[PDB]
Design a protein around this ligand. Structure first.
Ligand SMILES: O=C(O)C[C@H](NC(=O)OCc1ccccc1)C(=O)O
Ligand SMILES: [Ca+2]
Ligand SMILES: [Ca+2]
Ligand SMILES: [Ca+2]
Ligand SMILES: [Ca+2]
Ligand SMILES: [Zn+2]
Length: 316
């Protein structure tokens, strides 16, 4: 809508207070005019019709329990936007400042979040497996990164291409979490997963096997579940990314870590320049190697660590 840009205040899913960019026109709306063509957050009102209604509030204060997932969806979409802009010189997911839209309160007891081709969507969870999923910064960035991938490499959502797609979303979700510096880690979804269990998460990048996911190519899932294991075989690539950044010795192969900024630059370049819709793990290795070469030179430590990391997870 047309209106006046202002700043509201509210509480997120985890009870933290934060300011949010809003728009005033009779009501205060969750519409952030300060980033690209705008960031818009909607209420799906426990239904499955999308997007639902643009979030409207009477007093620009968002402290109701019902407000919390909208606050976080709105705020963390903003943070993710800032990450891609400030760190990668990318303007929104399409690179031309496309409007970012999110709906919360999707369905009832819905233990999921997704990117539907046009917008982000967050369930409230059932209160046992998940609390509202927009409460996790890595979750929000993971979803927005699907949009980025769709508009760039266009990796199809099956088999190894699909698993790369997932890993890219896990990689950048994590890098956004570190960028915001709010209890950052190499785990996925820990902030909103299983409120009755501390210390766990949906996935681990540092040790995927912790939650049943493969950390080596030899252990890859070859069946037909999960579109050929896109959420499973992503562990192989996640582990590789972790190793590139942090270093370590994995199945006897040692890797010198080059840090997360360089990890981000190498993978962002691979994603936006060399990956294709049907790229497999081997092609990803080649793309990451070419990216690191482009950025740091053929004989660099960066290139050598990329190679070591893929070697470590058995990807040639
Ligand atoms: O497969 C899909 O498209 C939906 C799936 N969604 C999903 O797993 O929701 C929970 C969650 C999301 C990100 C990080 C941790 C937990 C996905 O985005 O991969
Ligand atoms: Ca209010
Ligand atoms: Ca964390
Ligand atoms: Ca995390
Ligand atoms: Ca938990
Ligand atoms: Zn995903």
């Amino acid at each position: 809508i047309t209106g006046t840009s202002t700043v509201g205040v509210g509480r997120g899913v985890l009870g933290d207070q934060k300011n949010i960019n809003t728009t005033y026109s009779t009501y205060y709306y969750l519409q952030d005019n300060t980033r690209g063509n705008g960031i818009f957050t909607y209420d799906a009102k426990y239904r499955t019709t999308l997007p639902g209604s643009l979030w409207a509030d009477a007093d620009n204060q968002f402290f109701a329990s019902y407000d919390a997932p909208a606050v976080d969806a709105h705020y963390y979409a903003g943070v993710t936007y800032d990450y891609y802009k400030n760190v990668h010189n990318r303007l929104s997911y399409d690179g031309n400042n496309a409007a970012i839209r999110s709906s919360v309160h999707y369905s009832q007891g819905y233990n999921n979040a997704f990117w539907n081709g046009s917008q982000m969507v967050y369930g409230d969870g059932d209160g046992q497996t998940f609390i509202p999923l927009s409460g996790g910064i890595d979750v929000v960035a993971h979803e927005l990164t699907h949009a980025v991938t769709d508009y760039t490499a266009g990796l199809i959502y099956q088999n190894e291409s699909g698993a790369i797609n997932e890993a890219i979303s896990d990689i950048f979700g994590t890098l956004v979490e570190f960028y915001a510096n709010k209890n950052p880690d190499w785990e996925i979804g820990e902030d909103v997963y299983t409120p009755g269990i501390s210390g766990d998460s949906l996935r681990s990048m540092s040790d995927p096997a912790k939650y049943g996911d493969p950390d080596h190519y030899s252990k890859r899932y070859t069946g037909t579940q999960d579109n050929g294991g896109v959420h499973i075989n992503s562990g192989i690539i996640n582990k590789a990314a972790y190793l590139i950044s942090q270093g370590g010795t994995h199945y006897g192969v040692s890797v010198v870590g080059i840090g997360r900024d360089k990890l981000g630059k190498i993978f962002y370049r691979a994603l936006t320049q060399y990956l294709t819709p049907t790229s497999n793990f081997s092609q990803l290795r080649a793309a990451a190697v070419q990216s690191a070469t482009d950025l740091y030179g053929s004989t660099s430590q960066e290139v050598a660590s990329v190679k070591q990391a893929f070697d470590a997870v058995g990807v040639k």
